[PDB]
A paper describes a structure:
Herein we report a medicinal chemistry effort to optimize this hit, prioritizing maintenance of CDK9 selectivity while improving the on-target potency and overall physicochemical and pharmacokinetic (PK) properties. This allowed us to advance the initial SMM hit to the potent, selective, orally bioavailable CDK9 inhibitor 28 (KB-0742). Co-crystallization of compound 28 with CDK9/cyclin T1 confirmed ligand binding as predicted in our model, albeit at 3.8 Å resolution. Regardless of the low resolution, the co-crystal structure provided a partial density to confirm our predicted binding mode of compound 28. In brief, the amino-pyrazolopyrimidine core of 28 aligns to hinge Cys106 of the ATP-competitive binding pocket as postulated; the terminal amine of the diamino-cyclopentane moiety interacts with Asp109 in a HBD manner; and the 3-pentyl group points to a hydrophobic patch formed by the Leu156 side chain. An additional methyl to make symmetric 3-pentyl 28 delivered a 6 nM compound. A subsequent CDK selectivity panel demonstrated that this compound possessed a ≥66-fold selectivity toward CDK9 compared to others tested.
Cyclin-dependent kinase 9 (CDK9) has emerged as an attractive CDK target owing to its role in potentiating oncogenic transcription programs. CDK9 is a transcription-regulating CDK that acts as a subunit of the positive transcription elongation factor b (P-TEFb). P-TEFb is recruited to the genome by transcription factors and other components of the transcription machinery, where it is sequestered in an inactive ribonucleotide protein complex (7SK snRNP). Its activation is facilitated through multiple molecular mechanisms, including recruitment of specific transcription factors such as MYC, transcription elongation-promoting complexes such as those including bromodomain-containing protein 4 (BRD4) and the super elongation complex (SEC), and by splicing factors and co-transcriptional RNA processing events. Activated CDK9 within the P-TEFb complex phosphorylates multiple transcription substrates—most notably the serine 2 (Ser2) residue of the carboxy-terminal domain (CTD) heptad repeats of RNA polymerase II (RNAP II). CDK9 releases this paused state by phosphorylating the RNAP II Ser2 and allowing transcriptional elongation to proceed, making CDK9 an attractive target to attenuate unchecked transcriptional addiction to deregulated MYC. Phosphorylation of RNAP II Ser2 is an evolutionarily conserved and rate-limiting requirement for productive transcription elongation and mRNA processing. Although CDK9 is an essential gene and broadly required for global transcription, multiple studies have implicated highly transcribed, short half-life genes such as MYC and MCL1 as being uniquely sensitive to CDK9 inhibition.
Author numbering:
A (entry chain B): 8 to 259
B (entry chain A): 5 to 25, 32 to 91, 96 to 176, 180 to 260, 265 to 327
Amino acid sequence: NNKRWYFTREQLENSPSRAFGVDPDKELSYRQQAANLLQDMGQRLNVSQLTINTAIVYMHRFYMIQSFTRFPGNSVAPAALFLAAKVEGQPKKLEHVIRVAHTCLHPQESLPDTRSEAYLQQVQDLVILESIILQTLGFELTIDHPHTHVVKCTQLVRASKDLAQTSYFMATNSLHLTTFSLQYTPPVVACVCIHLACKWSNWEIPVSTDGKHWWEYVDATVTLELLDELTHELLQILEKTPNRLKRIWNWR
Amino acid sequence: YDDNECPFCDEVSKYEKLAKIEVFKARHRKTGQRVALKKVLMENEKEGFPITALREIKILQLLKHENVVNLIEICRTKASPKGSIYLVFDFCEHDLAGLLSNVLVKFTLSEIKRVMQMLLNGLFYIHRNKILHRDMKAANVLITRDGVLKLADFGLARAFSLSQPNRYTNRVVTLWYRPPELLLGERDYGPPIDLWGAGCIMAEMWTRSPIMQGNTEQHQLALISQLCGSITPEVWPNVDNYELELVKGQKRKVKDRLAAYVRDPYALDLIDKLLVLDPAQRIDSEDALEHDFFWSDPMPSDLKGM
Ligand SMILES: CCC(CC)c1cc(N[C@H]2CC[C@H](N)C2)n2nccc2n1
């Protein structure tokens, strides 16, 4: 199917995290936190943003089956990377991912001995969860991301160096801050990211001379009722996310 | 510790092992469909779940087409008291190697033609998705009860995309079915390594025999150099941007050697268009599919070897 890893708002409401006594909003924070780790970890490993995004998608799908009370964000994330690395063809040594994971989570604590049973176990735990996330996803590891549809769409509507890379950033952040990955398809998500980037970069794109709006060429299941519904949701959560909108804010 | 929670992974024991082709035959204990199951993983694998696996797994999922074996699903074991992870394939009655080695099952030119059309279209599809096979041999051509040709052993199969000069895997394929480019250590090659192989497998329909059995790598190079002649910038433009070795003073004899076993004029040619030194002058799949061995009488017929 193409609607197995997709869900309604009430489907998200009744996630596994709920029934183990964790709030709706608290879960989002549990999620948002797994991204930041995936991101920071990913930067220390010199893996792509793609790899990092793909790692975030696995975890976003993962905690639709498992519960954060059952599996911690911190225990799953280094697995989701290690896998995503291998999936997206930037394989990282298992030693390597552990170094980073450690110094992120435990900054003061220097790493245990590589001989000690301590380490050799925090080795295994990772190998464990890799196997588990494969099973959870059913080895469905290929991820279409909203970026691919943007990068094409921006050129195909001659966007500037600004509006294009702003749109890219919105998508990168539509994985960290929201469950758009679980609700809407990549092409839909792409449009939301461009529709906001436009309103923010104060450049509403001209309609084609046929009469069809720009979004109709990206995905026909899209409407302005939906874009203006969603862009607002994403803008808000960005407003809340600190010195996030500053990264794209024009000081001139 | 455990998980006790998995929607899209199955437990393998739903399928019932019968015998080995770690590759078992099997049957589903409800629907009674025959499958083949393939184990993975080892103690050797000391760096997470095998990546080579994830390569194959990902490829099999991508490739869906008439003549490319299907991965049904990937089922898993229970907690260790068989073990590891299994790849489920629609069972394919016979492979090609077994039907050739088997003296009984003899084919018509009519039946022999179709076989190829399924194969080359098969190759067409996989190359179309930018995935090389890199292991073309008779045993890797499967065929069903209906008579549906499939391809196997996408373990070696790699995703490709030629950008700058790229660095592909060097020693691939069986040594018998290996082509020239690879025997000089070409590491920026493309599909027509397979299309070579297909030629070796095509001729093997009549010869009923691996047509080249070079033990040494220069023994291989020698057996091929009997066919194409000397390895010349004439025949293969800029052959002298890589590699002295031996047997660079031969003359050609592609068709004439195996002519007594083909008989068909149209086929002899098709073999010789696949079996060229230069990969740029080695017929692609489409060219073959549209060739007039496929559009000539007697035309391709459905399989019923029995
Ligand atoms: C080299 C044989 C490969 C091993 C990966 C194979 C063989 C069969 N079937 C066998 C049964 C008897 C004949 N040798 C073909 N199947 N069936 C599905 C998948 C598959 N793969």
